[PDB]
Amino acid sequence: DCMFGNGKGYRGKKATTVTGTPCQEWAAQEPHRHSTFIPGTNKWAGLEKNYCRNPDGDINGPWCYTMNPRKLFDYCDIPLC
Numbered sequence: 864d865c866m867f868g869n870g871k872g873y874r875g876k877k878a879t880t881v882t883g884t885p886c887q888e889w890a891a892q893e894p895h896r897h898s899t900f901i902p903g904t905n906k907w908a909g910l911e912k913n914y915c916r917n918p919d920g921d922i923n924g925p926w927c928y929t930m931n932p933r934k935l936f937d938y939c940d941i942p943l944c
């Protein structure tokens with residue numbers, strides 16, 4: 864699928880970053896601990912499995928926590944609608 868504007872409403876199944884790195888699941892706390900952007904308390908941003916999302920409305924578009932233990936997050940690569 865494509866993304867509208869900055870992709871805040873994107874609900875597709877892309878689950879890798881721009882470089883191909885697998886995404887970490889939003890509910891997971893490994894390999895990266897995070898107190899923010901958890902599905903338990905954010906019920907409105909579609910924080911589902913390990914899919915690319917944009918809960919903070921970054922102009923750069925949808926992103927995910929990465930499975931690389933050194934690198935916290937990266938943007939994904941989804942075309943503009």
Ligand SMILES: O=C(O)c1cn(C2CC2)c2cc(N3CCNCC3)c(F)cc2c1=O
Pocket residue numbers: 896897898899919921926935936
């Ligand atoms: O406290 C935390 O766990 C985090 C706090 N922040 C904000 C900076 C204070 C984050 C910001 C991130 N970026 C997402 C993409 N748009 C820019 C901000 C991010 F990927 C993760 C976190 C955290 O885990």
